[PDB]
Every structure is written in C-alpha cells, then in structure tokens.
Symmetry: C2
Subunit: 90 residues, 2 copies
C-alpha cells in the first residue's frame, strides 16, 4: 500500500521488524490486552474476535514439562479441534 | 462359581473387597509388576499382555495440574488413540 511505503521511509528498521512479527504471529492487535501481555492460564478459555461472525475459541488445557531440548508441549483446543504446539522455553 | 462360594466362606470381608476392586479396575493381574506398583512415568509405553497376539498398548503423555476440584487430567494414548482420564489427587 502507499501506507506501507511512507511507513518504511519513516521507520526502516522498525517497519521491517514489524513485518517480521506479522509473518510470525499474524494480527496481534485483535487479541485482548490481558492475553497480549500474559498469555493464558491452565484451563482458561479466550475468544479472539477476528471479524464479523468469525472468532477463535481457544482453550489452554495444559503445558508439559520440557523435553531434553527445552521444548514444552502445549495442549490446546481451538474451534472444536485438539491441537499441540511446541515452544522452546528460553 | 463354587470357588467364589468357598473363598467367601474362608475370607468373607477380603473376598467382598476383592469383588469391589474387580468391579472398579478389572483384572489387575495382567499388568506387569512395576506398573502394578508404580503406574507410569511421562513418555513411557507399557504393553499389557492379554490373549497371545492381542495386547493393550498404553502411552502416558502428561499429567495436568489439579483443577479447582482437585482432579488432574492424564493424557494417554491407547492403541494409538488419544484418550483422557480424570483422577482425584489425594
């Protein structure tokens, strides 16, 4: 967009670092502030309002202990489907 | 059976308690001894030998934290099928 163009011109390092984040996590602005800053508790259900009549219902069921590589398994449910995500514990 | 009859006569209370356990847990004698005494560690696979050729394959993935009413959730895989159980932590 034209908005992309002056944005880059105005903030080259920042804007690229923004697009890098967008590529990794999608549109974070949709998240509620508590979720944005703190994530989710065990057993919590969060509803992310994407757009008119479309939303992500997410339940965090449990986080596992880290494997030998320091990776944790997160057991999620999202829109009625079981889901497993791996995060490296820093 | 006649065996029930004489076993109850010999050990009334113990026999009655044996039936309660059989009703609750089934045939424990099939489990291997270390599993009978200790259960399973996370990431472990245990094979219960029933009739030759057929075996129960149980994998323990994780155990969640205790929820508000003291129940932990165990995430199993049984014969390659995801499975959840609730246990009271005492």
């Amino acid at each position: 967009t034209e908005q992309d163009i002056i944005s880059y011109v105005l903030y080259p390092k920042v804007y690229e670092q923004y697009i890098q984040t967008r590529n990794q996590y999608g549109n974070l602005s949709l998240l509620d502030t508590p979720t944005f800053f703190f994530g989710m508790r065990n057993g919590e259900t969060v509803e992310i309002e994407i757009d008119k009549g479309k939303r992500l219902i997410i339940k965090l069921e449990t986080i596992s202990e880290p494997d030998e590589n320091g990776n944790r398994t997160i057991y999620y449910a999202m829109n009625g489907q079981a889901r497993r995500i791996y995060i490296k514990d820093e």
